[PDB]
């Protein structure tokens, strides 16, 4: 009669962070009881971070929506109770469909916007195709409030507009500018699995204004002043050249063998023969020759002997050297050149695409888009998609140079400003999913204002979050991890994997899957009302890869969307890229497809840069800036000035020191905010889980069941603070209240506080009084709306000055 | 037989995953955590040391919790585990105070009372704890693990004590403790300390282990090897 072990394990994927780990769910008596890493995973195996267990308080969250709703208070605002009442799916989508069709009749489909927060790889239909067919260019992702500045170095130096995996198992030196990979970043499960072991063969240095978990388990913690990371990166490169310890097999060497790099002195470009890099000597002559350890120590306070020793240790470890950048180092108004300066070291020491270094995700045959929709665009749609985007990307002061294109990248946080100012125009109809921009974007009160000015908005969400407060209609989502068909990927351990999301329980409430069932039902409703292009596109183009037939109903369509994109993994023989799977059923049962190991040096000699080299002098960035300048009939120097960078001339294209942007009077606001994530944050989605609070002190220095801001005792004494005091923290743009904690792991002159609390909605555990009073304090109310304009990224670090007081 | 655990502090990342797994496995009330931790910060900036030690019941050789128990409810089994016949617990609380490690908890409240609430944050729109309880068919909390009931109350009554049982119900089936499977670095290893060939027996011969409060004289059987931090360079 014993029951231990008699349940079933079913494969899915976690999305508590962009690690996107493959999981198994243990189900008994129809309930999900356990989560573990999927042993079939080649990236991480059964290894997991702690947040996997919090998933069970999300699907079984007692504040989830069980029905569509409409607001009945016609006023919108933080001060206005929406007075939601229940309606049917048919009525909710009827209301949305009517508003969309009215835009098309009025020849203003560009006044529709689709907002995307989290997502899976089946998102193309809801995000792009539905939006363009309606006739709008305003499919707005969250990428620029995430980490687009972190892609600038990799793209403009080695052609990778994307992330890297870090070969920790083979590393001999690990240098982290703000990354804390045993707590956050993009494979917490795998880097936690390996971090302790790696300390036995790698020297590890963590540069962070706070003592992170990773820094506590490192050979050196460098408590950098916020925004000064590039000073250390540049001085390390300088010493490497003076000492002659760049990685010659990758970079090259002087023609006559003798090292001619002497501090402060220019060198003939023609005396050096580069192999797989471009621009080393120009970089030296234009800037790096004067970035001495003494220069760096004066700015940072770091011992120059420590800088020199690090550079020499990296030289001896090459090419098994890897340099990490986090959001904290690069999501700053001038942060593009921190990504470039730190990532340049991965080329200088040969770690890029090398054993022990870092490299991109492996190739897989997963499809990422549904078929082209060109035949389904009518004249109304063709005209609308050409309009300027609501986030103003591509204007002189917003180059947002994703993948080398002026206006190529989203500017998520600025969409609130375009909407608020009706510039370029008014947004009249909005559909949003899996997002909470009032809470997650800097100075989110701007989204309060913007959303209050939108005639009709519908939010696809599990919970009534802060963003939902401003909705006309709520469309409750089936939970991504337990009630949904989806597909994701992950990279690490030298491989890329593709994993399934599948329902593991009977659907709890009257919800629908955001990315499949809802666009399908909406397309059907639009067709009933005379606009059938989305419906025709769906049932003629998204058909089963085996039978060629369209879906018979909602539930079938949810699975079909995954079958369509994954067919190359299980319908074909994918052996050339990794695993050979025999059937769709085997894919579902195992839950994951694994690639072959990464082929080291694969990209050497064929980077997707202008020169095909690893560019210390980025001709790739020069070409992109030239394009933007020519578009606006100005010089590149005038672009730099308009975007508030210090660089002029050749400095715009090389690693160089930008003084960090700061906002506010330092005498009034004497502390620099050090925003951090909680290691129990599933992005902005675990504040309504009681277990989160019970264990909140696993964040070093923090306090269970509380929201604390951490001060060094020096500053606590200065401002008369004691542990447990209720405090108000104020910046030039806003304030929050929380409690005080004194902790020596905080750099004096800074205050380290986790993002994630401060909800005033979401649920009964996340808020003090639902809809009225927050629990804890909302970090982004402190953070002025600022941008790394070359990337479009929002700034969350470095520029935030605050003051503190009791009560 | 004397089962015990070896925890490798260099592998440990101080994440609490073991303690969260214990919650899902054993149905402990909110605020009751059989697995927990002891964290310390030492030093003045910039020379700051942060360390984390995971804790559980040490299933001691000479257990004060067993010795003080007036009814014999707390007792040793044939594996060396300290287990509790919860039905015979009269709630005298002596075990909790006698335990030098503070790992025993008392059910002052009926567990999972928060799930009897039928209030809704959005009326007729969001659900409630009671409504979710009814929908899932669970008795006390939708997260309750029925496996726990194999050898111990799935939900303990008010006025009884409770602590880590070494996942005895999983051991009975040849399976691992929940915290062991939950650890990403495999930092936790269990086995028979009386068997010289067990991995735990070899681990403590290969490394000089640390124990918690060895001066109390209980003969704890959780051993810690290596160190959470590493030697500072430069
Ligand atoms: N536990 C957890 N893990 C996650 C997520 C989550 O929500 N929770 N989110 C996932 C996602 S979406 C993302 S994009 C990635 C992001 O992962 P990362 O880019 O690695 O960085 P963050 O986790 O955002 O943490 C920022 C860190 O920078 C520090 N820092 C702050 N200011 C500065 C500075 O000026 N200089 C330097 N050197 N450091 C500074 C903070 O102390 C903090 O440790 O993580 C993913 N992993
Ligand atoms: N100060 C500070 N701000 C930050 C960060 C930080 O470290 N510090 N991290 C930033 C980063 S890296 C990111 S990527 C962004 C992310 O920011 P967002 O994309 O806005 O994501 P969340 O805040 O997690 O909001 C997710 C919302 O989706 C809803 N929802 C929740 N679960 C589900 C589900 O299963 N299905 C569907 N359809 N909806 C669901 C809820 O309304 C939830 O509030 O936040 C960013 N903002
Ligand atoms: S929260 Fe992130 S790292 Fe942790 S199990 Fe989920 S996806 Fe993996
Ligand atoms: S799960 Fe493992 S790594 Fe995490 S705290 Fe527990 S013992 Fe340490
Ligand atoms: S740790 Fe405490 S509860 Fe566990 S056996 Fe020892 S004395 Fe008893
Ligand atoms: S509280 Fe229960 S188990 Fe503890 S000593 Fe008293 S009767 Fe024994
Ligand atoms: S052995 Fe079992 S009962 Fe003990 S701490 Fe680990 S999960 Fe909890
Ligand atoms: Mo992100
Ligand atoms: O991402
Ligand atoms: O993202």
mmCIF file of N, CA, C and O in Angstrom, chain A residues 282-353:
data_model
loop_
_atom_site.group_PDB
_atom_site.id
_atom_site.type_symbol
_atom_site.label_atom_id
_atom_site.label_comp_id
_atom_site.label_asym_id
_atom_site.label_seq_id
_atom_site.Cartn_x
_atom_site.Cartn_y
_atom_site.Cartn_z
ATOM 1 N N UNK A 282 46.564 49.745 -33.998
ATOM 2 C CA UNK A 282 45.780 50.980 -33.996
ATOM 3 C C UNK A 282 45.142 51.223 -32.624
ATOM 4 O O UNK A 282 45.125 52.348 -32.111
ATOM 5 N N UNK A 283 44.596 50.177 -32.018
ATOM 6 C CA UNK A 283 44.044 50.302 -30.669
ATOM 7 C C UNK A 283 45.105 50.803 -29.688
ATOM 8 O O UNK A 283 44.883 51.763 -28.934
ATOM 9 N N UNK A 284 46.277 50.178 -29.702
ATOM 10 C CA UNK A 284 47.378 50.647 -28.873
ATOM 11 C C UNK A 284 47.690 52.123 -29.135
ATOM 12 O O UNK A 284 47.772 52.927 -28.197
ATOM 13 N N UNK A 285 47.906 52.493 -30.409
ATOM 14 C CA UNK A 285 48.365 53.848 -30.728
ATOM 15 C C UNK A 285 47.332 54.898 -30.346
ATOM 16 O O UNK A 285 47.694 56.011 -29.942
ATOM 17 N N UNK A 286 46.050 54.577 -30.472
ATOM 18 C CA UNK A 286 44.999 55.562 -30.260
ATOM 19 C C UNK A 286 44.515 55.650 -28.822
ATOM 20 O O UNK A 286 43.870 56.641 -28.469
ATOM 21 N N UNK A 287 44.824 54.665 -27.980
ATOM 22 C CA UNK A 287 44.305 54.693 -26.617
ATOM 23 C C UNK A 287 45.015 53.749 -25.656
ATOM 24 O O UNK A 287 45.352 54.147 -24.538
ATOM 25 N N UNK A 288 45.190 52.487 -26.047
ATOM 26 C CA UNK A 288 45.587 51.478 -25.076
ATOM 27 C C UNK A 288 46.989 51.726 -24.546
ATOM 28 O O UNK A 288 47.291 51.330 -23.413
ATOM 29 N N UNK A 289 47.839 52.418 -25.319
ATOM 30 C CA UNK A 289 49.209 52.667 -24.878
ATOM 31 C C UNK A 289 49.280 53.462 -23.579
ATOM 32 O O UNK A 289 50.297 53.396 -22.877
ATOM 33 N N UNK A 290 48.239 54.223 -23.250
ATOM 34 C CA UNK A 290 48.250 55.071 -22.064
ATOM 35 C C UNK A 290 47.351 54.551 -20.954
ATOM 36 O O UNK A 290 47.231 55.206 -19.906
ATOM 37 N N UNK A 291 46.722 53.389 -21.145
ATOM 38 C CA UNK A 291 45.858 52.822 -20.109
ATOM 39 C C UNK A 291 46.679 51.971 -19.144
ATOM 40 O O UNK A 291 46.495 50.762 -19.043
ATOM 41 N N UNK A 292 47.601 52.632 -18.433
ATOM 42 C CA UNK A 292 48.550 51.954 -17.575
ATOM 43 C C UNK A 292 47.885 51.479 -16.282
ATOM 44 O O UNK A 292 46.820 51.970 -15.882
ATOM 45 N N UNK A 293 48.534 50.562 -15.567
ATOM 46 C CA UNK A 293 48.016 50.197 -14.237
ATOM 47 C C UNK A 293 47.946 51.385 -13.292
ATOM 48 O O UNK A 293 47.062 51.444 -12.435
ATOM 49 N N UNK A 294 48.877 52.325 -13.396
ATOM 50 C CA UNK A 294 48.832 53.504 -12.539
ATOM 51 C C UNK A 294 47.630 54.378 -12.884
ATOM 52 O O UNK A 294 46.969 54.913 -11.992
ATOM 53 N N UNK A 295 47.354 54.556 -14.178
ATOM 54 C CA UNK A 295 46.147 55.251 -14.611
ATOM 55 C C UNK A 295 44.913 54.593 -14.019
ATOM 56 O O UNK A 295 44.024 55.277 -13.502
ATOM 57 N N UNK A 296 44.849 53.258 -14.076
ATOM 58 C CA UNK A 296 43.665 52.542 -13.605
ATOM 59 C C UNK A 296 43.520 52.624 -12.089
ATOM 60 O O UNK A 296 42.402 52.752 -11.570
ATOM 61 N N UNK A 297 44.639 52.528 -11.367
ATOM 62 C CA UNK A 297 44.599 52.582 -9.907
ATOM 63 C C UNK A 297 44.112 53.941 -9.416
ATOM 64 O O UNK A 297 43.407 54.031 -8.400
ATOM 65 N N UNK A 298 44.501 55.019 -10.103
ATOM 66 C CA UNK A 298 44.059 56.342 -9.670
ATOM 67 C C UNK A 298 42.544 56.459 -9.754
ATOM 68 O O UNK A 298 41.912 57.084 -8.898
ATOM 69 N N UNK A 299 41.942 55.866 -10.783
ATOM 70 C CA UNK A 299 40.494 55.931 -10.950
ATOM 71 C C UNK A 299 39.788 54.963 -10.000
ATOM 72 O O UNK A 299 38.787 55.322 -9.368
ATOM 73 N N UNK A 300 40.291 53.723 -9.878
ATOM 74 C CA UNK A 300 39.536 52.650 -9.233
ATOM 75 C C UNK A 300 39.960 52.361 -7.805
ATOM 76 O O UNK A 300 39.184 51.747 -7.062
ATOM 77 N N UNK A 301 41.171 52.744 -7.414
ATOM 78 C CA UNK A 301 41.711 52.319 -6.137
ATOM 79 C C UNK A 301 42.267 50.907 -6.125
ATOM 80 O O UNK A 301 42.751 50.457 -5.085
ATOM 81 N N UNK A 302 42.201 50.185 -7.242
ATOM 82 C CA UNK A 302 42.785 48.849 -7.308
ATOM 83 C C UNK A 302 44.306 48.945 -7.275
ATOM 84 O O UNK A 302 44.917 49.815 -7.920
ATOM 85 N N UNK A 303 44.928 48.053 -6.514
ATOM 86 C CA UNK A 303 46.385 47.986 -6.433
ATOM 87 C C UNK A 303 46.960 47.715 -7.819
ATOM 88 O O UNK A 303 46.543 46.746 -8.466
ATOM 89 N N UNK A 304 47.874 48.545 -8.328
ATOM 90 C CA UNK A 304 48.423 48.258 -9.666
ATOM 91 C C UNK A 304 49.129 46.919 -9.738
ATOM 92 O O UNK A 304 49.128 46.295 -10.797
ATOM 93 N N UNK A 305 49.702 46.432 -8.636
ATOM 94 C CA UNK A 305 50.323 45.114 -8.652
ATOM 95 C C UNK A 305 49.292 44.015 -8.879
ATOM 96 O O UNK A 305 49.608 42.989 -9.482
ATOM 97 N N UNK A 306 48.065 44.202 -8.388
ATOM 98 C CA UNK A 306 46.991 43.236 -8.638
ATOM 99 C C UNK A 306 46.598 43.208 -10.107
ATOM 100 O O UNK A 306 46.421 42.127 -10.687
ATOM 101 N N UNK A 307 46.471 44.384 -10.730
ATOM 102 C CA UNK A 307 46.180 44.439 -12.162
ATOM 103 C C UNK A 307 47.261 43.702 -12.950
ATOM 104 O O UNK A 307 46.968 42.880 -13.823
ATOM 105 N N UNK A 308 48.534 43.981 -12.644
ATOM 106 C CA UNK A 308 49.643 43.365 -13.373
ATOM 107 C C UNK A 308 49.624 41.854 -13.187
ATOM 108 O O UNK A 308 49.800 41.088 -14.150
ATOM 109 N N UNK A 309 49.405 41.401 -11.951
ATOM 110 C CA UNK A 309 49.415 39.970 -11.682
ATOM 111 C C UNK A 309 48.281 39.265 -12.415
ATOM 112 O O UNK A 309 48.464 38.162 -12.937
ATOM 113 N N UNK A 310 47.099 39.880 -12.465
ATOM 114 C CA UNK A 310 45.976 39.277 -13.183
ATOM 115 C C UNK A 310 46.317 39.120 -14.658
ATOM 116 O O UNK A 310 46.089 38.062 -15.258
ATOM 117 N N UNK A 311 46.867 40.175 -15.266
ATOM 118 C CA UNK A 311 47.190 40.113 -16.685
ATOM 119 C C UNK A 311 48.192 39.001 -16.967
ATOM 120 O O UNK A 311 48.063 38.274 -17.963
ATOM 121 N N UNK A 312 49.203 38.865 -16.105
ATOM 122 C CA UNK A 312 50.200 37.808 -16.286
ATOM 123 C C UNK A 312 49.585 36.420 -16.102
ATOM 124 O O UNK A 312 49.906 35.483 -16.857
ATOM 125 N N UNK A 313 48.705 36.266 -15.101
ATOM 126 C CA UNK A 313 48.043 34.980 -14.901
ATOM 127 C C UNK A 313 47.184 34.621 -16.103
ATOM 128 O O UNK A 313 47.147 33.456 -16.515
ATOM 129 N N UNK A 314 46.461 35.607 -16.658
ATOM 130 C CA UNK A 314 45.675 35.373 -17.865
ATOM 131 C C UNK A 314 46.578 35.015 -19.040
ATOM 132 O O UNK A 314 46.273 34.101 -19.821
ATOM 133 N N UNK A 315 47.702 35.715 -19.179
ATOM 134 C CA UNK A 315 48.654 35.351 -20.213
ATOM 135 C C UNK A 315 49.114 33.903 -20.120
ATOM 136 O O UNK A 315 49.196 33.204 -21.131
ATOM 137 N N UNK A 316 49.429 33.436 -18.904
ATOM 138 C CA UNK A 316 49.905 32.064 -18.732
ATOM 139 C C UNK A 316 48.794 31.036 -18.919
ATOM 140 O O UNK A 316 49.077 29.885 -19.291
ATOM 141 N N UNK A 317 47.531 31.420 -18.666
ATOM 142 C CA UNK A 317 46.403 30.509 -18.848
ATOM 143 C C UNK A 317 45.944 30.405 -20.298
ATOM 144 O O UNK A 317 45.285 29.422 -20.658
ATOM 145 N N UNK A 318 46.246 31.405 -21.118
ATOM 146 C CA UNK A 318 45.741 31.464 -22.482
ATOM 147 C C UNK A 318 46.022 30.155 -23.219
ATOM 148 O O UNK A 318 47.123 29.597 -23.100
ATOM 149 N N UNK A 319 45.088 29.675 -24.056
ATOM 150 C CA UNK A 319 43.800 30.296 -24.392
ATOM 151 C C UNK A 319 42.625 29.884 -23.510
ATOM 152 O O UNK A 319 41.483 30.220 -23.844
ATOM 153 N N UNK A 320 42.897 29.210 -22.394
ATOM 154 C CA UNK A 320 41.849 28.734 -21.490
ATOM 155 C C UNK A 320 41.428 29.853 -20.525
ATOM 156 O O UNK A 320 41.473 29.731 -19.301
ATOM 157 N N UNK A 321 41.001 30.965 -21.123
ATOM 158 C CA UNK A 321 40.698 32.212 -20.429
ATOM 159 C C UNK A 321 39.317 32.657 -20.883
ATOM 160 O O UNK A 321 39.045 32.680 -22.090
ATOM 161 N N UNK A 322 38.455 33.021 -19.928
ATOM 162 C CA UNK A 322 37.107 33.483 -20.239
ATOM 163 C C UNK A 322 36.730 34.689 -19.398
ATOM 164 O O UNK A 322 36.936 34.707 -18.184
ATOM 165 N N UNK A 323 36.184 35.695 -20.059
ATOM 166 C CA UNK A 323 35.770 36.937 -19.439
ATOM 167 C C UNK A 323 34.256 37.056 -19.590
ATOM 168 O O UNK A 323 33.736 37.129 -20.711
ATOM 169 N N UNK A 324 33.562 37.119 -18.464
ATOM 170 C CA UNK A 324 32.115 37.294 -18.406
ATOM 171 C C UNK A 324 31.743 38.764 -18.210
ATOM 172 O O UNK A 324 32.378 39.481 -17.429
ATOM 173 N N UNK A 325 30.684 39.205 -18.883
ATOM 174 C CA UNK A 325 30.054 40.476 -18.557
ATOM 175 C C UNK A 325 28.614 40.239 -18.141
ATOM 176 O O UNK A 325 27.880 39.489 -18.787
ATOM 177 N N UNK A 326 28.201 40.921 -17.091
ATOM 178 C CA UNK A 326 26.808 40.909 -16.675
ATOM 179 C C UNK A 326 26.124 42.214 -17.092
ATOM 180 O O UNK A 326 26.764 43.222 -17.437
ATOM 181 N N UNK A 327 24.791 42.197 -16.997
ATOM 182 C CA UNK A 327 23.975 43.405 -17.082
ATOM 183 C C UNK A 327 24.547 44.558 -16.270
ATOM 184 O O UNK A 327 24.504 45.720 -16.700
ATOM 185 N N UNK A 328 25.023 44.239 -15.063
ATOM 186 C CA UNK A 328 25.461 45.282 -14.152
ATOM 187 C C UNK A 328 26.585 46.110 -14.738
ATOM 188 O O UNK A 328 26.608 47.340 -14.596
ATOM 189 N N UNK A 329 27.526 45.447 -15.429
ATOM 190 C CA UNK A 329 28.640 46.171 -16.033
ATOM 191 C C UNK A 329 28.232 46.955 -17.281
ATOM 192 O O UNK A 329 28.797 48.030 -17.541
ATOM 193 N N UNK A 330 27.266 46.462 -18.058
ATOM 194 C CA UNK A 330 27.059 46.983 -19.404
ATOM 195 C C UNK A 330 25.722 47.685 -19.612
ATOM 196 O O UNK A 330 25.605 48.457 -20.581
ATOM 197 N N UNK A 331 24.705 47.458 -18.775
ATOM 198 C CA UNK A 331 23.411 48.124 -18.972
ATOM 199 C C UNK A 331 23.458 49.488 -18.281
ATOM 200 O O UNK A 331 22.830 49.742 -17.246
ATOM 201 N N UNK A 332 24.263 50.358 -18.894
ATOM 202 C CA UNK A 332 24.528 51.722 -18.457
ATOM 203 C C UNK A 332 24.529 52.582 -19.711
ATOM 204 O O UNK A 332 24.716 52.078 -20.822
ATOM 205 N N UNK A 333 24.340 53.892 -19.528
ATOM 206 C CA UNK A 333 24.098 54.773 -20.676
ATOM 207 C C UNK A 333 25.261 54.806 -21.671
ATOM 208 O O UNK A 333 25.058 55.109 -22.858
ATOM 209 N N UNK A 334 26.486 54.545 -21.217
ATOM 210 C CA UNK A 334 27.636 54.460 -22.117
ATOM 211 C C UNK A 334 28.197 53.039 -22.178
ATOM 212 O O UNK A 334 29.355 52.829 -22.583
ATOM 213 N N UNK A 335 27.359 52.055 -21.841
ATOM 214 C CA UNK A 335 27.812 50.705 -21.553
ATOM 215 C C UNK A 335 28.225 49.892 -22.759
ATOM 216 O O UNK A 335 28.912 48.872 -22.593
ATOM 217 N N UNK A 336 27.826 50.299 -23.965
ATOM 218 C CA UNK A 336 28.319 49.602 -25.153
ATOM 219 C C UNK A 336 29.839 49.432 -25.103
ATOM 220 O O UNK A 336 30.366 48.383 -25.483
ATOM 221 N N UNK A 337 30.572 50.456 -24.653
ATOM 222 C CA UNK A 337 32.031 50.369 -24.672
ATOM 223 C C UNK A 337 32.607 49.608 -23.482
ATOM 224 O O UNK A 337 33.787 49.235 -23.536
ATOM 225 N N UNK A 338 31.788 49.285 -22.466
ATOM 226 C CA UNK A 338 32.196 48.302 -21.464
ATOM 227 C C UNK A 338 32.069 46.876 -22.008
ATOM 228 O O UNK A 338 32.956 46.040 -21.792
ATOM 229 N N UNK A 339 30.978 46.574 -22.716
ATOM 230 C CA UNK A 339 30.883 45.274 -23.361
ATOM 231 C C UNK A 339 32.063 45.073 -24.302
ATOM 232 O O UNK A 339 32.720 44.024 -24.283
ATOM 233 N N UNK A 340 32.372 46.098 -25.110
ATOM 234 C CA UNK A 340 33.489 45.995 -26.058
ATOM 235 C C UNK A 340 34.820 45.828 -25.315
ATOM 236 O O UNK A 340 35.659 44.993 -25.684
ATOM 237 N N UNK A 341 35.055 46.647 -24.283
ATOM 238 C CA UNK A 341 36.351 46.611 -23.597
ATOM 239 C C UNK A 341 36.567 45.282 -22.871
ATOM 240 O O UNK A 341 37.672 44.720 -22.888
ATOM 241 N N UNK A 342 35.537 44.769 -22.204
ATOM 242 C CA UNK A 342 35.686 43.489 -21.509
ATOM 243 C C UNK A 342 35.790 42.318 -22.488
ATOM 244 O O UNK A 342 36.638 41.428 -22.324
ATOM 245 N N UNK A 343 34.958 42.312 -23.527
ATOM 246 C CA UNK A 343 34.974 41.205 -24.473
ATOM 247 C C UNK A 343 36.252 41.193 -25.307
ATOM 248 O O UNK A 343 36.687 40.125 -25.737
ATOM 249 N N UNK A 344 36.880 42.351 -25.522
ATOM 250 C CA UNK A 344 38.154 42.381 -26.233
ATOM 251 C C UNK A 344 39.166 41.438 -25.587
ATOM 252 O O UNK A 344 39.983 40.827 -26.287
ATOM 253 N N UNK A 345 39.112 41.280 -24.258
ATOM 254 C CA UNK A 345 40.052 40.386 -23.593
ATOM 255 C C UNK A 345 39.864 38.938 -24.030
ATOM 256 O O UNK A 345 40.821 38.146 -24.010
ATOM 257 N N UNK A 346 38.636 38.559 -24.397
ATOM 258 C CA UNK A 346 38.415 37.196 -24.869
ATOM 259 C C UNK A 346 39.117 36.950 -26.203
ATOM 260 O O UNK A 346 39.509 35.817 -26.515
ATOM 261 N N UNK A 347 39.328 37.998 -26.985
ATOM 262 C CA UNK A 347 40.128 37.858 -28.187
ATOM 263 C C UNK A 347 41.621 37.957 -27.913
ATOM 264 O O UNK A 347 42.426 37.206 -28.480
ATOM 265 N N UNK A 348 42.002 38.889 -27.035
ATOM 266 C CA UNK A 348 43.418 39.129 -26.771
ATOM 267 C C UNK A 348 44.105 37.897 -26.191
ATOM 268 O O UNK A 348 45.258 37.599 -26.538
ATOM 269 N N UNK A 349 43.415 37.155 -25.330
ATOM 270 C CA UNK A 349 43.978 35.945 -24.754
ATOM 271 C C UNK A 349 43.547 34.667 -25.478
ATOM 272 O O UNK A 349 43.851 33.568 -25.000
ATOM 273 N N UNK A 350 42.882 34.790 -26.629
ATOM 274 C CA UNK A 350 42.571 33.648 -27.464
ATOM 275 C C UNK A 350 41.457 32.744 -26.973
ATOM 276 O O UNK A 350 41.310 31.628 -27.489
ATOM 277 N N UNK A 351 40.667 33.182 -25.994
ATOM 278 C CA UNK A 351 39.622 32.344 -25.430
ATOM 279 C C UNK A 351 38.434 32.156 -26.340
ATOM 280 O O UNK A 351 37.727 31.149 -26.230
ATOM 281 N N UNK A 352 38.210 33.090 -27.256
ATOM 282 C CA UNK A 352 37.069 32.982 -28.152
ATOM 283 C C UNK A 352 37.206 31.715 -29.000
ATOM 284 O O UNK A 352 38.214 31.509 -29.692
ATOM 285 N N UNK A 353 36.191 30.842 -28.913
ATOM 286 C CA UNK A 353 36.135 29.567 -29.630
ATOM 287 C C UNK A 353 37.270 28.611 -29.251
ATOM 288 O O UNK A 353 37.614 27.712 -30.031
#
